[PDB]
């Protein structure tokens, strides 16, 4: 895989000056300046569904760090991008919309009908230690 990407598919080289760069990111920045079109805003947001464009690389660095920070779900630690990403993923845990089933983390048999009732099993066969966070998190 490395041989193909270093002897035949020269993807890390400039299309114009024939320098090369240690990551595609720096090649992109290089093309955006040293071989740039007459465009006023040489930088464009690299992320999903974002259409914004910028004059100086520092403003793009700021925009990525502000509006596309890479987060982990507070409950399930799965990664997501930006405020919308977190708010979209938080629906999955929501007990008002997602009228989910109720089970033990270990015991195969459980089949509760309400959240308060599920805490009886975790309060007796387990205890207040090693209950799952989605059950515990009365955060709203």
Partner DNA sequence: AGATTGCAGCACCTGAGTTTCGCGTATGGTCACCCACTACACTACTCGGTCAGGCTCTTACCAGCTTAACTACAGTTGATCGGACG
Which residue ranges make up the site for DNA (CB under 7 A)? 1-2, 5-6, 11-12, 23-26, 61, 64-65
Written as six digits, the tokens of 30 are 């290089």
Please, what is the minimum distance in Å from the beta carbon of residue 66 to Zn ion?
9
61 binds, among DNA, Zn ion, none (CB under 5 to 8 A by kind): DNA
104 binds, among Zn ion, DNA, none (CB under 5 to 8 A by kind): Zn ion
In terms of CB distance, is 5 or 133 closer to DNA?
A: 5
98 binds, among DNA, Zn ion, none (CB under 5 to 8 A by kind): none
| H-helix segments, the chain | 2-3, 24-34, 57-67, 82-93, 115-122, 133-136
Task: Say if residues 49 and 56 touch (Cβ distance below 8 Å).
Answer: no
- Nearest in space to 32 (alpha carbons), one of 69, 21, 62, 50: 21
């Amino acid at each position: 895989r490395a041989h193909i990407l270093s002897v035949h598919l020269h993807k890390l080289t400039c299309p114009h000056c024939n320098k090369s760069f240690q990551r595609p990111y720096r090649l992109r920045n290089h093309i955006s300046k040293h071989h740039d079109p007459e465009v006023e805003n040489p930088y464009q947001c690299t992320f999903a569904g974002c259409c914004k464009e910028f004059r100086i690389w520092s403003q793009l660095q700021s925009h990525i760090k502000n509006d596309h920070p890479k987060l982990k779900c507070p409950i399930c630690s799965k990664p997501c991008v930006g405020e919308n990403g977190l708010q979209m993923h938080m629906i999955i845990h929501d007990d008002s919309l997602v009228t989910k089933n109720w089970k033990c983390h270990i015991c195969p048999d459980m089949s509760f009908s309400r959240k308060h009732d599920l805490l009886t099993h975790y309060g007796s066969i387990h205890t207040e230690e090693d209950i799952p966070l989605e059950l515990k998190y009365k955060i709203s």
